[PDB]
């Protein structure tokens, strides 16, 4: 207590004003570890610390308290929150959940993301001054004034410390002034002094007429000494419930004294830990558990605007990603230009131009798929957490993501299409160049939407990548350049009818060979099926395919959960 920092402010600048929140659980019995006869009652102003086996597999106790859970879902007890039965609406309106893994954008500062969360949480009735005052009070409450302008970047970036990241996450989850606070392993991977400061901050937050629940596996001595209420959970069954300072006295009174120079929590955890020997230690924990019972707004448009602004601010500040994207785009453009260099004494032939167009059409989709899959899986967990928190109903989020990707997509298209039309010595003019540019832009946009749908459809990164590669190979083989687009009986014909690469190649052929007769244009278009659809028909088909892919992506976002 005397070895840690003592120059702090014990004042509370942002307290909870309202009725005291209550959380009462009566005979909780979870099934698929082995929670049997769990019952506790906490009120506002007390800090409940769940030590020991605070999990039931992949989901912790705080997850089943809030109603979540990755394992089973059958229940056998009752959960009373503020005098009302458990329900998703109540846990979403009153209960706040702070996960172990943070969800913060590295390209944003603390103040920016705090203002964004405040705008997405507070209703439309609150003016900008009220939101600014709330943000300032949240910053001053957690003592984040010395890092309000510094970035919150994760590893591989400067950012800030881990404790400051946890404080920023707490402020994000505490902006809408919740009544019940819940954190899952807040001091995981932090420094000892940092963990002590975080525990002191959580205790000060709980002291301001609030309810804070902490789940820790192996708490330290200084962490256990500051606990207000403690609940010993070993293999799902509770052993002790009350003050932390009285746990040693209760264990001495029940006939289990704590040895000198030994942590009480660790000793009481490893004393009743289950291992012939498994059944001998099971009756010991059940005897202590059985005896313990005998002694006792703002709107869709506003949310879309906030989301697109946050996405733009996060994308325009990612220097290495944009730099590597531009570098690879320039490399591909220079390769395409210098490989099919038409300027000189010898000009390009028909097969050379056809191969050049086919490569321009079917080389960028691979890198596009890779980049979109990476960008989707770098924030799938954050998106799932934001959807579970109850900010938006993923209605305008689709349009927000589309309008945030559109600038980067257009920039990449420009960078890839500038040094490729003049170096290859194609058909001169402005209208054919603009048509080729628009066709390439639409094809790459359709490929991006397909990648988004494939990422949102499959939760596994490797499985989604394999499915995207399979679709890319199916659309590549369906082109009118490899299998002549004539040897398709029933399946490849219908595959090419919906393959954007085939339509792209057909449009490029019809644009570059429009009334052109070269020595050894109309004959090759007659012998192939490229003349069966005019240019505007190809454009309409591409637009329809893009719309269908967007509809599929929206359906996958609305129905399929984005479980990490």
């Amino acid at each position: 207590d005397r070895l840690f920092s003592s120059e702090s402010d014990n004042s509370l600048y942002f307290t909870y004003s309202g009725q005291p929140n209550t959380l009462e659980v009566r005979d909780l019995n979870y099934q698929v570890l082995g929670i049997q006869n769990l019952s506790f009652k906490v009120r506002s102003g007390q800090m409940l610390a769940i030590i020991g086996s605070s999990g039931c597999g992949r989901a912790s106790l705080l997850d089943v308290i809030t109603g979540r859970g990755h394992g089973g879902k059958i229940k056998s007890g009752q959960i009373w929150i503020n005098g009302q039965p458990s329900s998703p609406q109540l846990v979403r309106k009153c209960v706040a959940h702070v996960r172990q893994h943070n969800q913060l954008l590295p390209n944003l500062t603390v103040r920016e993301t705090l203002a964004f969360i405040a705008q997405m949480r507070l209703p439309r009735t609150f003016s900008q001054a009220q939101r600014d005052k709330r943000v300032e009070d949240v910053i001053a409450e957690l003592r984040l004034r010395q890092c309000a302008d510094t970035r919150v970047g994760n590893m591989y970036v400067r950012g800030l410390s881990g404790g400051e990241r946890r404080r920023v996450s707490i402020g994000v989850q505490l902006l809408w002034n919740p009544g019940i606070l819940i954190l899952d392993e807040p001091t995981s991977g932090l420094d000892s002094f940092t963990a002590h400061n975080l525990v002191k901050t959580l205790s000060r937050l709980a002291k301001g007429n609030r309810l804070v629940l902490i789940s820790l596996h192996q708490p330290r001595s200084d962490i256990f000494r500051l606990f207000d209420l403690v609940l010993l959970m070993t293999s799902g069954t509770p052993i002790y419930l009350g003050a932390a300072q009285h746990m040693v006295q209760y264990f001495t009174a029940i006939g289990y004294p704590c040895p000198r120079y030994s942590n009480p929590a660790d000793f009481y955890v490893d004393l009743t830990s289950i291992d012939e020997q498994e059944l001998a230690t099971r009756e010991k924990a059940q005897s202590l558990a059985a005896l313990f019972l005998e002694k006792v707004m703002p709107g869709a448009v506003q949310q879309f605007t906030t989301l697109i602004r946050r996405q733009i601010s996060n994308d325009f500040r990612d220097l290495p990603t944009l730099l590597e994207h531009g570098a690879e785009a320039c490399l591909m453009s220079m390769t395409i230009g210098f490989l099919y260099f038409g300027h000189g004494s010898i000009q390009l032939s028909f097969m050379d131009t056809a191969a050049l167009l086919f490569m321009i059409g079917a080389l960028i989709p691979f890198n596009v798929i890779l980049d979109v899959i990476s960008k989707c899986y770098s924030e799938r967990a954050m998106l799932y957490y934001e959807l579970e928190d109850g900010l938006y109903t993923t209605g305008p989020y689709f349009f927000a993501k589309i309008l945030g990707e559109l600038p980067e997509h257009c920039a990449y298209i420009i960078i890839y299409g500038m040094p490729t039309y003049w170096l290859a010595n194609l058909r001169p003019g402005l209208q054919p160049f603009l048509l080729h540019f628009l066709l390439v832009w639409l094809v790459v946009f359709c490929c991006r939407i397909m990648a988004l749908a494939a990422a949102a459809l499959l939760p596994t990164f490797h499985m989604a990548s394999f499915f995207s590669n399979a679709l890319y190979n199916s659309f590549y083989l369906a082109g009118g350049f490899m299998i002549n687009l004539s040897s398709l009986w029933t399946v490849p014909a219908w595959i090419s009818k919906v393959s954007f690469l085939r339509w792209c190649f057909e449009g490029l052929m019809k644009i570059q060979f429009s009334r052109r007769t070269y020595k050894m244009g109309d004959k090759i278009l007659s012998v192939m099926e490229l003349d069966s659809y005019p240019l505007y028909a190809i454009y309409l088909i591409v637009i329809g395919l893009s719309g269908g892919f967007m509809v599929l992506y929206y359906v996958s976002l609305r129905f399929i959960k984005q479980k990490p």
Partner: antibody
Framework: VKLVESGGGLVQPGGSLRLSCATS????????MEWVRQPPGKRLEWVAV??????????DYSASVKGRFIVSRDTSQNILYLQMNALRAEDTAIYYC??????????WGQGTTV | IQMTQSPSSLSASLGERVSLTCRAS??????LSWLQQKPDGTIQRLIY???SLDSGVPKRFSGSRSGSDYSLTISSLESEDLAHYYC?????????FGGGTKLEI
């Protein structure tokens, strides 16, 4: 918002004196209460702070006067009090009565010579 | 956090643009306030957060920031500006003040 300081006079070293800070024009049970002094030849120095009702009217002092000064507030009359013990040695200043510190020192008082 | 305000004294006539410099020992992220102690004794805050102004404060007072050095620029000075200025920080506990600047006509 108006702040009026009172209780200044000539005292002996080791005696006792109590200052009065009148509050008017704002809610006394919703805002903080700060005590800032000023030596005749030095800069401003924060002395103590009186928290609002949300903090159970807890008090806090600086590392230089911790244990000798006692600050209290009257909710019925909206008057702040500061009990000063072992003064006239170095605590002689032009003590002012401030309202808020975390939100910027605004709406200062008049100040009296102790 | 030590607040070093420069210069210790400044003398100018009416109509010139005066600027006071205040440097913080650590990073406050723009949490700085400016005070005005009149010779009579009544102190009044002029600029808070180094960017905004209080109620009843004339528009001649402005605040700027250049890296880690905060500047209080006062243009079109009148005779009613003869007072002391103290810069303070409230981003880290405890709140410390500056050295001060005696602005005289």
């Amino acid at each position: 918002v108006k702040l009026v300081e009172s209780g200044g006079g000539l005292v002996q070293p080791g005696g006792s004196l109590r200052l009065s800070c009148a509050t008017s024009g704002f809610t006394f049970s919703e805002f903080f209460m700060e005590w800032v002094r000023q030596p005749p030849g030095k800069r401003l120095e924060w002395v103590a702070v009186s928290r609002n009702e949300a903090n159970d009217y807890t008090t806090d002092y600086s590392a230089s006067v911790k244990g000798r000064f006692i600050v209290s507030r009257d909710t019925s009359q909206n008057i702040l009090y500061l009990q000063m013990n072992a003064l006239r040695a170095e605590d002689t200043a032009i003590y002012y009565c401030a309202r808020d510190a975390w939100m910027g020192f605004d709406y200062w008082g008049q100040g009296t010579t102790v | 956090i030590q607040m070093t305000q420069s210069p210790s004294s400044l003398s100018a006539s009416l109509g010139e643009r005066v600027s006071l410099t205040c440097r913080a020992s650590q990073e406050i992220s723009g949490y700085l306030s400016w005070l005005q102690q009149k010779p009579d004794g009544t102190i009044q805050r002029l600029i808070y957060a180094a960017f905004s102004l209080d109620s009843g404060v004339p528009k001649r007072f402005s605040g700027s920031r250049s890296g880690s050095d905060y500047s209080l620029t006062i243009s079109s000075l009148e005779s009613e500006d003869l007072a002391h200025y103290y810069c303070l920080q409230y981003a880290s506990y405890p709140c410390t003040f500056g050295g001060g600047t005696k602005l005289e006509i």
